[PDB]
Symmetry: D2
Subunit: 115 residues, 4 copies
């Protein structure tokens, strides 16, 4: 699998578990088409979203549902979601690891891109 997402909780110092996320891919008509979705495990990671064959070049958006995550922990956060928008595989296949670090009023996102 060439796309993995890892989410961490900066309030608890732990993986962010059961975080839902939705991946979209921009279509020829410039609309966002649903591509894949899932939720993080006990390790805060979401594996198996796609395959090398299906993950063609394109513009992808990973929408991490942070508001639902915080609300279930009793926190009313600032953001609706954390978004990561990027062009993938523009120069051939790559493996992408997207990491998100969450706090109620802030988030950081990092991508590790390997060949």
């Amino acid at each position: 699998c060439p796309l993995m997402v890892k989410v961490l909780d900066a309030v608890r110092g732990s993986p962010a578990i059961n975080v839902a996320m939705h991946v979209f891919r921009k279509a020829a008509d410039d609309t966002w088409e649903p591509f894949a979705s899932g939720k993080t495990s006990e390790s805060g990671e979401l594996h198996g979203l796609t395959t090398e064959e299906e993950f063609v070049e394109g513009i992808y958006k990973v929408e991490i549902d942070t508001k639902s995550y915080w609300k279930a922990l009793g926190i009313s956060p600032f953001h609706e979601h954390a978004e990561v928008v990027f062009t993938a595989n523009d120069s051939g296949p790559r493996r992408y690891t997207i990491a998100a670090l969450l706090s109620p009023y802030s988030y950081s996102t990092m991508a590790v891109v390997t060949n």
Copy 2:
């Protein structure tokens, strides 16, 4: 004005100058409608996007055109743009400051909400 955006460049250690950004409000049909836009100043700030009268409760999105900023610097970036999506709520008097810290493969965003 109740909304200000500040953008910083973690590669140069400076304000991110001349960064374009577009603000959208979620409409009835669940689509994003243009609301305001501009480019950051020499201080990396964008003031005067809206007014207390126009900035009613709702869901807003701030799209920061980070890829165009890094291309102008000759640095290959990961993200197409940075997005900050949030709900504006009238829980007494409020001012919103959205800060974005940019790096080529990472971004951090923070929201300061004050009375």
Copy 3:
């Protein structure tokens, strides 16, 4: 004054008020000597730590007393304090703004150096 420090709280979405900080300069014997100190204001800022005359080239450390800030809020933190260690260099006229974004198990720091 050529050095300013700003501290923000990512749990509350606010300036971090009344945070103590201590600034040190590295001495001849390679030890850290007190140089300046204070507490952040209602805006989360600490101005007037030093002057152009006193702030000569050298290695400085800013220790931000974050654990005491989180204890006052009743939140269990990871770090004892945050540290920012850097060299001040006279490469023409300069102003240094050190920003710190705090969460209980994470911290981010940024330096804006301007002419």
Copy 4:
């Protein structure tokens, strides 16, 4: 091993390889005693710094040598090092994963603490 450090480079979107770090432990006389040291591998991780037996309760400091890392890549960064100071094992043994995300003028650090 109850202590692991992972370092990532936000300019390249990759693990930060060959990053040296030194761990210190505060002694009874309030001085920092050398505890362990090593450098990150190709994955940006440093494993095997200590054992459950040697990693007793105390105040530890992980000094990550970021300036040397950036200089070898042709960048003159702001910070001398990234520091992580924390009390370990105060409520019994824990496993600590410290993550640092580096840019030339900024760094973020996160700790995942597990039982």
